[PDB]
Amino acid sequence: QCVNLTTRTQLPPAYTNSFTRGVYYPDKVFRSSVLHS
Amino acid sequence: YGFQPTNGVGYQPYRVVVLSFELLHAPATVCGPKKSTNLVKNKCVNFNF
Ligand SMILES: *[C@@H]1O[C@H](CO)[C@@H](O)[C@H](O)[C@H]1NC(C)=O
């Protein structure tokens, strides 16, 4: 029931710069102005 | 294992259950059955949350 969709594209994917993204809270622990490494 | 009823102990089948308590980082979960009285404030108290 599924379709061939893929058209061959010569172009490669580009590259960008993740300046400062993708940071998360690795706990459900409350902190208050504590510089934590 | 070819288990047979006329086997000396140490060759008879034993059933095993391994309970493993884990503590990720959630807010809470299952536990023993205590009581859960009430709560108070502004007094030096002995608490369990
Ligand atoms: C396209 O679909 C047909 C069946 O509809 C299948 O036989 C064929 O392998 C498909 N093409 C590719 C490249 O997989």
Curated annotation (Swiss-Prot), chain B:
Positions of the UniProt region annotated as Disordered: 25-47
Resulting phenotype, residue 25 to P: Increased resistance to human covalescent sera neutralization
Impact reported for residue 4 to R: In strain: Omicron/BA.1, Omicron/BA.2, Omicron/BA.2.12.1, Omicron/BA.2.75, Omicron/BA.4, Omicron/BA.5, Omicron/BQ.1.1, Omicron/XBB.1.5, Omicron/EG.5.1
Effect of residue 2 to S: In strain: Omicron/BA.1
Biological function: Attaches the virion to the cell membrane by interacting with host receptor, initiating the infection. The major receptor is host ACE2. When S2/S2' has been cleaved, binding to the receptor triggers direct fusion at the cell membrane. When S2/S2' has not been cleaved, binding to the receptor results in internalization of the virus by endocytosis using host TFRC and GRM2 and leading to fusion of the virion membrane with the host endosomal membrane. Alternatively, may use NRP1/NRP2 and integrin as entry receptors.
Quaternary state and interactors: Binds to host ACE2. RBD also interacts with the N-linked glycan on 'Asn-90' of ACE2. Cleavage of S generates a polybasic C-terminal sequence on S1 that binds to host Neuropilin-1 (NRP1) and Neuropilin-2 (NRP2) receptors. Interacts with host integrin alpha-5/beta-1 (ITGA5:ITGB1) and with ACE2 in complex with integrin alpha-5/beta-1 (ITGA5:ITGB1). May interact via cytoplasmic c-terminus with M protein. May interact (via N-terminus) with host bilirubin and biliverdin, thereby preventing antibody binding to the SARS-CoV-2 spike NTD via an allosteric mechanism.
Protein name: Spike protein S1
The organism's taxonomic lineage, starting at the top: Viruses, Riboviria, Orthornavirae, Pisuviricota, Pisoniviricetes
Section of the entire sequence shown: 495 to 543 of 1273
